[PDB]
Design a protein around this nucleic acid. Sequence first.
DNA 1: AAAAACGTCAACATTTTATAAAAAAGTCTTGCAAAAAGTTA
DNA 2: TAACTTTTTGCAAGACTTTTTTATAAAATGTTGACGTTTTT
Lengths: 123, 113
Amino acid sequence: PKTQRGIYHNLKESEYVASNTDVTFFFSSELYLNKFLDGYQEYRKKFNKKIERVAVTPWNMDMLADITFYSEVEKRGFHAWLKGDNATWREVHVYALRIMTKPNTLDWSRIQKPRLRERRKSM
Amino acid sequence: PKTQRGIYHNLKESEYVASNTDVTFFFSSELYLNKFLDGYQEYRKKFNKKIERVAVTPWNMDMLADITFYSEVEKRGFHAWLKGDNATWREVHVYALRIMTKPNTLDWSRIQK
DNA sequence: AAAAACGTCAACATTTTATAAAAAAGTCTTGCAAAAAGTTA
DNA sequence: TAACTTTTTGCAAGACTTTTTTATAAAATGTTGACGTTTTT
């Protein structure tokens, strides 16, 4: 896959990947991968403000900020893994609920492309 | 306990009570009790509209809207029960967290001690 | 040894970001007049 | 309860402050088609 300019319209096959150790996001372009890795920390700051003006809760909404940021940056789709398995949007959001009870936040990082095994395994 | 005018600065011993069968909110004055019962269904719209601008999610945040609203209406304190037991502010939220994954919303209604 | 097939890479076509400026929605005072609560005897 | 005083409430008119739009240039991504090479015969 991967067009002449470097875009993967079929996320599963991408080589642009990011993972926070729990969740893995695939992107269609390096442009998006870096857009995501470069500004997610900022996005979290700005995310928490907006939300605090709507409600005050004992929760760490960072992961939720990360999915929203992901969704806003990847214009060509949505494909993610949750600890190795194929994860849907709702499934990543469930993880985000369970994890917002935790005070600290895992950071993100680029990681090499999975590998046919890990891929067939995730489904 | 109750002022002459009928205000309970000690919500723990108030007769102005609203409940949704799962949790129960104690008000300090019938006025606040009704400001709540009369304005919550509308707050849920306003609330989800507001939250929806920050992020779209598969969740039903009404209860969180409910807890938030309670906090802004009851100006003389915060007291609540969760399935019979006294509930800290954090425990009511934990609960609001669970019901987030439930499609329908419990409605509120006045009750008596 | 070519003709057909490929693969690379300018050069021009389109689609997407990035922003600055403007518009518009939404918030946060300030000021009483009114309703609620506190006091008073 | 009644009568009076002091707080909260409700709203309206401005002054501000984010969000949403627009518009437009910049930056990406997409396409096309000579031009050398490769591989098929």
